[model samples]
Target: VNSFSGYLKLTDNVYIKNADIVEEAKKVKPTVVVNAANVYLKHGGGVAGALNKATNNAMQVESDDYIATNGPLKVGGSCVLSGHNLAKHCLHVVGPNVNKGEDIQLLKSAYENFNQHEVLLAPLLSAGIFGADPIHSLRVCVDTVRTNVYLAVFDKNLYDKLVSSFL
Candidate 1:
């Protein structure tokens, strides 16, 4: 969200936004905003925590409701919930603790298994603070998602990398 001119169109339907993921979700009201979360789907920290705080933890409440019904999301697995004050719904996907290389494919699977939304706002998953290098995660996302993704990047370096990748 640090003055990177809002966003840039990376390819035809792919985009990189230099802003908060929750902020973009509120503004655009996409069909879903990707929550890169742990297997338990607890909104304890990171993007999950931010989304929980933004929605007054109703998102957390819903996630708990869901896990109680379906159990924790397995790696590369997903579920959806009311976005509360964010997107129309949240697409919750559990990513692997990746830098493990084998787990990198699970990160790709996280994106691939998304149940086809018309608009999706997302972050570079399992990287920044998860494990893999930033660019590695970026490559997985940019290459995996085929259309209409608004990839929300929260930092300057990741934003710079996003822009540079498509050029």
Candidate 2:
């Protein structure tokens, strides 16, 4: 496997260290607003920080108003998802066994509850990049939500699209 790390220096005023795609979003605050996937709840910072940054400065919401969860809970005490409580709601989608049906439902529920103004945040592909099928994970999201997809993880092609679309 190949692991890579880098940093993004926005303006002299705002520079982010040890950042991935999610961290980059926090720094840039794109017009559309998006966040990256977190693989392995341990290493992946998840979407809380990026979401907080995106909504920060807006009078409508703040950092302390959001709620975060680590995928769909199995039983209890397995993992904890913590974040702001009043800003908005965040849910981590998890599936039991190999079946992704449950995960899809959870994602749909999160999307449904989201207000038109508040962006829905989630880990890319349920954070299913490690030794799992990337395409499959993406499919789950597509099948659940058919609206315009603003990718959280940016590639060269995606970067071009974002620039052209929002510039």
Q: Model 1 over residues 53-159: C-alpha lDDT tens digits?
A: 99987888888888898887788877777878887888887778654444667878877755377667888778665776767777777678885777787887768
* 1-167 per-residue lDDT for model 2 (tens digits): 11112423223211113234444444443333332212222223334344444445231142123223333234111222332322223333332212323333344333322223223323344333322333444444444443333344434553343234431
CA shift of 164, model 2, Å? 19
TM-scores, in order shown?
A: 0.88, 0.35
* Candidate 2, position 11, lDDT: 30
Over 4 Å off, model 1: 1-5, 99-102, 165-167
Highest lDDT: give the candidate number: 1
User: Could you say which candidate leads in TM-score?
Assistant: 1
